[PDB]
Task: inverse folding
């Protein structure tokens, strides 16, 4: 019942009682752990709303108050009559902040309470979505001094009028399969870069073409829009020593902004809820740049450094990796764009965990995702035991729209 | 039931059916995952079923399931259990058992080598002095002048729980740790408590930074006894860097034989409490953990200084830079002295081939992702991108309480 987690580097032990409120399943059983798998009605709704409202009222120290009771009945009546309900602005803000607070795979949750929420529940068209999104991008980019934000479009009704942002992230580079059998640009977006053409986009066929938003409103077919170039802050990457680095012709966008998840608050589902914060260096330097199935640039950087790539044990990949990540952090920092390194981010998360353990009784966390993709054990989270479990409000995964949309 | 795992770097998907033979618990539930938690005398009653499951696997393995040989053996063991409350394994069954505990060790990345294991049968051993001799022979054989060979030595199984054989050392070869009155530590901080037990037991500590600890051996439930491993038998490697001539002056060196001695080997319900095993090192065990963990040798700073990196702010990634160099130094030193060692790229690439092979020929390969991915350069090794299923199969290697916490001293 009362579990404990120990940090093997500092011997600190914390007791976990928050998991006892867990609702959703984990995919694991007492017989098999699936910790490393990426993706493991009115009657149904009122209980969910109640769970939510109770925690909301408790958070504002009015648990059991008349207001609490009053609200509880009002929603109940609305569900019984409308088969759904609308959240109060306050409940919306609280819900969004808590879905972030509950995101077990996010290392930057110490920032959870500082989130700007844009209520786009009055939106009705794709052009309106485009308008709300540009405003979001501009707000969060803030000339390089990034601010976390989320824009929340209308909740699901009958499933046949869902709002969706077809892009996986608001800002990403296109990818095209060339005759050479090779891939141009970002390989992960090949299929998306094509659906933009299948729709009309005029691909400049470059190695870093900011893709076009493909917005779907109220259920209709998605429409294209080109984010005002002046709104997309990008950073050219140079090394603070290797002058040849720039010649690689590398750059990355400054706004990390996930747009394909589903936000669940009190039983309600928000299928279009783009959110953004600021980067941790490794996401770009290690994953976007060095992943084999991504820009896969290790060999090139290695050759440029004249390293013995004959034998794996000279660790040329490792040496290069470090430089490629020193570069990213260097550039961003030079151009004054917010960014955090894995050492600082993980240290933060540990502080946050301790706070969450003493003020909430726990902090759900997925070790597989929390530990950086490079230098694992020299970051504190590596030695930190973590308990993973699901709490609502939450951000959930949902099917790519192009595999569900009936045109 | 069928389960699938996917590799996100190659899109390759695999199907697991082996998990259906999993019996032990994982620590997880449908409500909480304990995937990153380090540590989540039998009765006749519970023993024959364990014996039967094991003998069925053995007899199937040799394609003699249901044979007369198979049925007689089951009848033999059954009778032995009702009669003596336990039973003895044939030599062939012990070997098969040991090899399989390694094959089922989901936290082991070097399992492609599982069928090549030299098993030393020390079940006729009765005293600590006898244990020492057995252990010396294992160290000499395994080391093989630098051309390492995997091996395991198996001492008498548990009986009433009051006569256990135990190797008090966590690893056969490790360096002493000494807490100074100023609060600093000389040597390996992880072995400070064990070193104190050794000193208290009579060990004359040379108090340096790399003193090979003495073996503390317990036979038949009696009080443990100290022994010094013949120095000539302890292979060591001086650590130097291929380009940094000052690295050698850091005064670092490491032993060549990695060898776990505190685990419990379970085969057919029987418990082998003293079962030291050894293989050869993956560079990062020494380069990343033993040297760079903050609670171990912690050499990141001193190495950093010498290289004159910008240590003012973490974003220079000075820690990461000194980490690669040190790991380069460990691999180089071992290769130069012709002592077997494998880097993390090579080891993980092999594990992936091993794993696929295992799904095809066995229907699975239980693996613990948290332990399989190297402690540095995680995502540039193929295992990072590999989904894994973790479940427990027997025969297996299990944790057991440290003996100083359970032993009834006799004086
Ligand atoms: C302000 C700085 C922030 C930092 C430094 C940060 C960092 C991280 C990192 C490193 C990841 C893993 C990315 C990957 O490997 O794909 C992540 C994932 C995630 N973050 Fe944060 N984050 C921040 C802000 C946000 C915000 C504003 C929200 C929510 C409103 C959020 C929600 C999540 C979720 C749900 C995931 C997992 C997404 C998935 O499963 O693919 N993050 N975060
Ligand atoms: C051939 C060389 C081998 C290599 C390269 C290899 C490598 C490794 C490494 C990197 C670890 C993780 C160590 C740690 O972080 O503490 C490990 C764990 C393990 N290995 Fe292997 N191994 C090899 C041979 C063996 C042998 C021969 C056995 C058994 C007969 C074995 C049994 C295990 C077990 C049980 C674990 C988990 C230990 C624990 O839970 O503390 N390994 N191995
Ligand atoms: C198979 C495995 O779960 C997968 O490669 C995970 C590992 N850890 C990760 N961690 C983070 N932060 N992001 C990822 O995409 C992944 N991928
Ligand atoms: C808390 C966490 O489980 C712990 O630090 C684990 C992580 N992965 C590991 N992996 C290996 N190989 N060895 C270890 O000791 C650990 N420690
Ligand atoms: N959802 C899987 C893809 N996630 C991508 C991987 N890099 C940016 C984004 C994560 C993310 C979201 C918010 C902030 C941040 N630093 N990182
Ligand atoms: N069992 C906890 C400590 N394990 C230590 C960590 N480094 C050597 C040994 C593992 C081990 C056993 C066998 C072979 C190998 N390469 N590594
Ligand atoms: Zn689990």
Result:
């Amino acid at each position: 019942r009362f579990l404990k987690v120990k940090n093997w580097e500092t011997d600190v032990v914390l007791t976990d009682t928050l998991h006892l409120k867990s609702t959703l399943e984990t995919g694991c059983t007492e017989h098999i752990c699936m910790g490393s798998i990426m993706l493991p009605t009115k009657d149904q709704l009122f209980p969910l709303a109640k769970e939510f409202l109770d925690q909301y009222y408790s958070s504002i120290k009015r648990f059991g108050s008349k207001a609490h009771m009053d609200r509880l009945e009002e929603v109940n009546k609305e569900i019984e009559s409308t088969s759904t309900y609308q959240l109060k602005d306050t409940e919306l803000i609280y819900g969004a902040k808590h879905a972030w607070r509950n995101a077990s795979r996010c290392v930057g949750r110490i920032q959870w309470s500082k989130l700007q929420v844009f209520d786009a529940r009055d939106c009705t068209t794709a052009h309106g979505m485009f308008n709300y999104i540009c405003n979001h991008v501009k707000y969060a980019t803030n000339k390089g001094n990034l601010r976390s934000a989320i824009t929340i479009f209308p909740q699901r009704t009958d499933g046949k009028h869902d709002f969706r942002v077809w892009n996986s992230q608001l800002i990403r580079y296109a990818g095209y399969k060339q005759p050479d059998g090779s891939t141009l640009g970002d390989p992960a977006n090949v299929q998306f870069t094509e659906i933009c053409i299948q729709q009309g986009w005029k691909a400049p066929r470059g190695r870093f073409d900011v893709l076009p938003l493909l917005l779907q409103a109220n259920g209709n077919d998605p429409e294209l829009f080109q984010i005002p170039p002046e709104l997309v802050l990008e950073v050219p990457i140079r090394h603070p020593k290797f002058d040849w680095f720039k010649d690689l012709g590398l750059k990355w966008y400054g706004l990390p902004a996930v747009s394909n998840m589903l936000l669940e608050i009190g039983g309600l589902e928000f299928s279009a809820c783009p959110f953004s914060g600021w980067y941790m260096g490794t996401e770009i330097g290690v994953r976007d740049y060095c992943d084999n199935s991504r820009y896969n640039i290790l060999e090139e950087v290695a050759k440029k450094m004249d390293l013995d790539m004959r034998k794996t044990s000279s660790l040329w990949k490792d040496q290069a990796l470090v430089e490629i990540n020193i570069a990213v952090l260097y550039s961003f920092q030079s151009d004054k764009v917010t960014i955090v390194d894995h050492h600082s981010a993980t240290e933060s998360f540990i502080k946050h965990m301790e706070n969450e353990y003493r003020c909430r009784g726990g902090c759900p966390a997925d070790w597989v995702w929390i530990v950086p993709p490079m230098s694992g054990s020299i970051t504190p989270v590596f030695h930190q035991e973590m308990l993973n479990y699901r709490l609502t409000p939450s951000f959930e995964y949902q099917p790519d729209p192009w595999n569900t949309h009936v045109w």
Summary: The pocket of zinc ion (ligand 7) is lined by residues A 28, 33-35; B 28, 33-35 (CB under 6 Å). The CA atoms of residues 89 and 218 of chain A lie 21 Å apart. The longest helix of chain A spans residues 316-334.
